[PDB]
Write an enzyme that holds these catalytic residues in place. Structure first.
Site, PDB file in Angstrom:
ATOM      1  N   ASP A 172       0.827  -1.212   0.000  1.00  0.00           N
ATOM      2  CA  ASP A 172       0.000   0.000   0.000  1.00  0.00           C
ATOM      3  C   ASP A 172       0.863   1.264   0.000  1.00  0.00           C
ATOM      4  O   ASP A 172       1.708   1.481   0.904  1.00  0.00           O
ATOM      5  CB  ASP A 172      -0.902  -0.054   1.226  1.00  0.00           C
ATOM      6  CG  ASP A 172      -1.841   1.135   1.327  1.00  0.00           C
ATOM      7  OD1 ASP A 172      -3.037   0.960   1.025  1.00  0.00           O
ATOM      8  OD2 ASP A 172      -1.376   2.231   1.722  1.00  0.00           O
TER       9      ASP A 172
ATOM     10  N   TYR B  54       2.284  10.426  -1.065  1.00  0.00           N
ATOM     11  CA  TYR B  54       3.487  10.096  -0.269  1.00  0.00           C
ATOM     12  C   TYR B  54       4.782  10.378  -1.050  1.00  0.00           C
ATOM     13  O   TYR B  54       5.856  10.485  -0.447  1.00  0.00           O
ATOM     14  CB  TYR B  54       3.499   8.633   0.249  1.00  0.00           C
ATOM     15  CG  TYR B  54       2.248   8.089   0.968  1.00  0.00           C
ATOM     16  CD1 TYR B  54       1.439   8.895   1.783  1.00  0.00           C
ATOM     17  CD2 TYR B  54       1.930   6.726   0.864  1.00  0.00           C
ATOM     18  CE1 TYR B  54       0.307   8.349   2.461  1.00  0.00           C
ATOM     19  CE2 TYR B  54       0.805   6.173   1.506  1.00  0.00           C
ATOM     20  CZ  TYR B  54      -0.007   6.988   2.294  1.00  0.00           C
ATOM     21  OH  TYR B  54      -1.117   6.409   2.913  1.00  0.00           O
TER      22      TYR B  54
ATOM     23  N   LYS C 263      -3.289   5.533  -4.370  1.00  0.00           N
ATOM     24  CA  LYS C 263      -4.375   6.443  -3.981  1.00  0.00           C
ATOM     25  C   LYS C 263      -4.322   7.763  -4.760  1.00  0.00           C
ATOM     26  O   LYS C 263      -3.218   8.249  -5.102  1.00  0.00           O
ATOM     27  CB  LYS C 263      -4.353   6.734  -2.475  1.00  0.00           C
ATOM     28  CG  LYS C 263      -4.150   5.488  -1.593  1.00  0.00           C
ATOM     29  CD  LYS C 263      -4.256   5.812  -0.128  1.00  0.00           C
ATOM     30  CE  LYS C 263      -3.988   4.550   0.690  1.00  0.00           C
ATOM     31  NZ  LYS C 263      -2.573   4.418   1.059  1.00  0.00           N
TER      32      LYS C 263
ATOM     33  N   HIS D 154      -8.107   9.132  -1.689  1.00  0.00           N
ATOM     34  CA  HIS D 154      -7.322   9.238  -0.448  1.00  0.00           C
ATOM     35  C   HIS D 154      -8.079   9.901   0.714  1.00  0.00           C
ATOM     36  O   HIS D 154      -7.946   9.492   1.860  1.00  0.00           O
ATOM     37  CB  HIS D 154      -6.016   9.999  -0.748  1.00  0.00           C
ATOM     38  CG  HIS D 154      -4.885   9.676   0.175  1.00  0.00           C
ATOM     39  ND1 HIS D 154      -3.565   9.842  -0.197  1.00  0.00           N
ATOM     40  CD2 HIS D 154      -4.867   9.200   1.441  1.00  0.00           C
ATOM     41  CE1 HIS D 154      -2.784   9.496   0.813  1.00  0.00           C
ATOM     42  NE2 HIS D 154      -3.548   9.078   1.810  1.00  0.00           N
TER      43      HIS D 154
ATOM     44  N   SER E 180       6.689  -1.217   9.322  1.00  0.00           N
ATOM     45  CA  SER E 180       7.940  -1.111  10.055  1.00  0.00           C
ATOM     46  C   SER E 180       9.023  -0.851   9.020  1.00  0.00           C
ATOM     47  O   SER E 180       8.855  -1.198   7.857  1.00  0.00           O
ATOM     48  CB  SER E 180       8.246  -2.402  10.836  1.00  0.00           C
ATOM     49  OG  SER E 180       9.573  -2.385  11.335  1.00  0.00           O
ATOM     50  N   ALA E 181      10.103  -0.206   9.462  1.00  0.00           N
ATOM     51  CA  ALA E 181      11.272   0.050   8.610  1.00  0.00           C
ATOM     52  C   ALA E 181      12.336  -1.034   8.809  1.00  0.00           C
ATOM     53  O   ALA E 181      13.373  -1.045   8.136  1.00  0.00           O
ATOM     54  CB  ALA E 181      11.848   1.458   8.896  1.00  0.00           C
TER      55      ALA E 181
HETATM   56  N1  LIG Z   1       6.714  -5.557  15.467  1.00  0.00           N
HETATM   57  C1  LIG Z   1       7.090  -4.373  16.042  1.00  0.00           C
HETATM   58  N2  LIG Z   1       7.645  -4.363  17.291  1.00  0.00           N
HETATM   59  C2  LIG Z   1       8.038  -3.209  17.874  1.00  0.00           C
HETATM   60  N3  LIG Z   1       7.891  -2.030  17.247  1.00  0.00           N
HETATM   61  C3  LIG Z   1       7.347  -1.984  16.009  1.00  0.00           C
HETATM   62  C4  LIG Z   1       6.939  -3.152  15.381  1.00  0.00           C
HETATM   63  N4  LIG Z   1       6.437  -2.802  14.169  1.00  0.00           N
HETATM   64  C5  LIG Z   1       6.536  -1.449  14.061  1.00  0.00           C
HETATM   65  N5  LIG Z   1       7.090  -0.952  15.188  1.00  0.00           N
HETATM   66  C6  LIG Z   1       7.408   0.464  15.558  1.00  0.00           C
HETATM   67  O1  LIG Z   1       6.217   1.133  15.959  1.00  0.00           O
HETATM   68  C7  LIG Z   1       6.288   2.527  15.612  1.00  0.00           C
HETATM   69  C8  LIG Z   1       5.034   2.940  14.841  1.00  0.00           C
HETATM   70  O2  LIG Z   1       5.260   2.862  13.454  1.00  0.00           O
HETATM   71  P1  LIG Z   1       4.161   3.266  12.339  1.00  0.00           P
HETATM   72  O3  LIG Z   1       4.856   2.865  11.064  1.00  0.00           O
HETATM   73  O4  LIG Z   1       3.679   4.711  12.436  1.00  0.00           O
HETATM   74  O5  LIG Z   1       2.995   2.212  12.733  1.00  0.00           O
HETATM   75  P2  LIG Z   1       1.388   2.413  12.739  1.00  0.00           P
HETATM   76  O6  LIG Z   1       0.834   1.052  12.960  1.00  0.00           O
HETATM   77  O7  LIG Z   1       0.969   3.604  13.587  1.00  0.00           O
HETATM   78  O8  LIG Z   1       1.033   2.925  11.289  1.00  0.00           O
HETATM   79  C9  LIG Z   1       1.532   2.240  10.173  1.00  0.00           C
HETATM   80  C10 LIG Z   1       0.915   3.097   9.109  1.00  0.00           C
HETATM   81  O9  LIG Z   1       1.874   3.921   8.448  1.00  0.00           O
HETATM   82  C11 LIG Z   1       1.407   4.103   7.091  1.00  0.00           C
HETATM   83  C12 LIG Z   1       0.366   3.012   6.821  1.00  0.00           C
HETATM   84  O10 LIG Z   1      -0.922   3.616   6.597  1.00  0.00           O
HETATM   85  C13 LIG Z   1       0.393   2.135   8.078  1.00  0.00           C
HETATM   86  O11 LIG Z   1      -0.849   1.585   8.570  1.00  0.00           O
HETATM   87  C14 LIG Z   1       7.584   2.732  14.846  1.00  0.00           C
HETATM   88  O12 LIG Z   1       8.509   3.364  15.742  1.00  0.00           O
HETATM   89  C15 LIG Z   1       8.026   1.320  14.457  1.00  0.00           C
HETATM   90  O13 LIG Z   1       9.437   1.194  14.486  1.00  0.00           O
HETATM   91  P3  LIG Z   1      10.220   0.429  13.324  1.00  0.00           P
HETATM   92  O14 LIG Z   1      11.661   0.701  13.653  1.00  0.00           O
HETATM   93  O15 LIG Z   1       9.756   1.005  12.011  1.00  0.00           O
HETATM   94  O16 LIG Z   1       9.834  -1.034  13.471  1.00  0.00           O
END
Ligand SMILES: Nc1ncnc2c1ncn2[C@@H]1O[C@H](COP(=O)(O)OP(=O)(O)OC[C@H]2OC[C@H](O)[C@@H]2O)[C@@H](O)[C@H]1OP(=O)(O)O
Length: 274
Positions: free
Chosen positions: A44, A49, A74, A107, A230-231
């Protein structure tokens, strides 16, 4: 092994995908490549973006047949319009280096009903032309849905909305289901802020799972298609690993009890951007 959902136009989508949001070109390409390697197939992105081309490069380099990949993008709010939306879909394809996308979404409602209705008519042409397999919307409220369905008699396949235990969208999920629209939840971790919520950590500890796994599993159990991010290549893989356990009804109820209207992303009732 990922389960699917069937849409109202007979197409199917995986129940989990990765969204790249506003990641830079390099970061977007890195996460999509990692996701594809880990087994994600639903990807997605959005014109707003600015990273579509980067996503396209990750797809091109993956060595996975196009037919097996499900690409969502989008229509940016400034590009809304009947004629302009059709051009914007085609420009998105050029950037992505693709001949079609699997799902193309408005969007944001964007605060002008004429324009989003016209955009919807444009998107219907986009689908008829084979540019997008399915068409849908993001961040539409019940009134916005009633407006497009009333005027066009063509129902969105998906309504992609912010959704997590602080904003569980029960009311809007019920509206979506009544129209036979699939709910796609985004922001399921609440920018990571929800990872240390005590109700979430208690349930994770109870199951021997992580807080992130609990938050994503809860959303799956509501019936949503879940878009996470996640990155990090390992955490990306961990986010796909949410089919090995089930939350109990008691735990679903606890998480369903946390709604307080917190939005970490903009409010579509007001927001006029993209
Ligand atoms: N498995 C796991 N364990 C620990 N920490 C994690 C994990 N996965 C992601 N993260 C972390 O959680 C934080 C939230 O990330 P985000 O991409 O805004 O997440 P959202 O869910 O608020 O939103 C994602 C939206 O962004 C755009 C799209 O519409 C998505 O739905 C970020 O610091 C990530 O760090 P990390 O270093 O990247 O892992």
């Amino acid at each position: 092994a990922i389960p699917t959902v069937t849409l109202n136009d007979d197409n199917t989508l995986p129940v989990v995908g990765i969204g790249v949001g506003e990641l830079s070109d390099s970061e977007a390409e890195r996460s999509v490549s990692a996701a594809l390697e880990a087994g994600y197939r639903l990807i997605d992105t959005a014109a707003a973006y600015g990273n579509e081309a980067a996503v396209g490069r990750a797809i091109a380099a993956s060595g996975i047949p196009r037919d097996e990949i499900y690409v969502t993008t989008k229509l940016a709010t400034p590009d809304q319009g009947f004629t302009s939306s059709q051009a914007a879909a085609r420009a998105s394809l050029e950037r992505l280096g693709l001949d079609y996308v699997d799902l193309y979404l408005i969007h944001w409602p964007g605060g002008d009903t004429s324009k989003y209705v016209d955009s919807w008519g444009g998107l219907m042409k986009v689908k008829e032309d084979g540019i997008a397999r399915s068409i849908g919307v993001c961040n539409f409220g019940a009134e916005d849905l009633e407006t497009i369905v009333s005027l066009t008699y063509f129902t969105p396949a998906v309504n992609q909305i912010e959704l997590h235990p602080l904003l569980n969208q029960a009311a809007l999920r019920e509206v979506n289901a009544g129209y036979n629209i699939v709910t796609e939840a985004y922001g399921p971790l609440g920018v990571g802020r929800l990872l240390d919520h005590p109700a979430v950590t208690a349930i994770a500890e109870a199951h021997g799972r992580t807080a992130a796994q609990v938050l994503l599993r809860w959303s799956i159990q509501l019936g949503n298609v879940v878009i996470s991010r996640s990155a990090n290549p390992e955490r990306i893989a961990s986010n796909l690993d949410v089919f090995g356990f089930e939350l109990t009804a008691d735990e679903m109820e606890t998480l369903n009890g946390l709604d307080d209207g917190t939005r970490f992303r903009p409010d579509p009732a007001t927001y006029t951007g993209s």
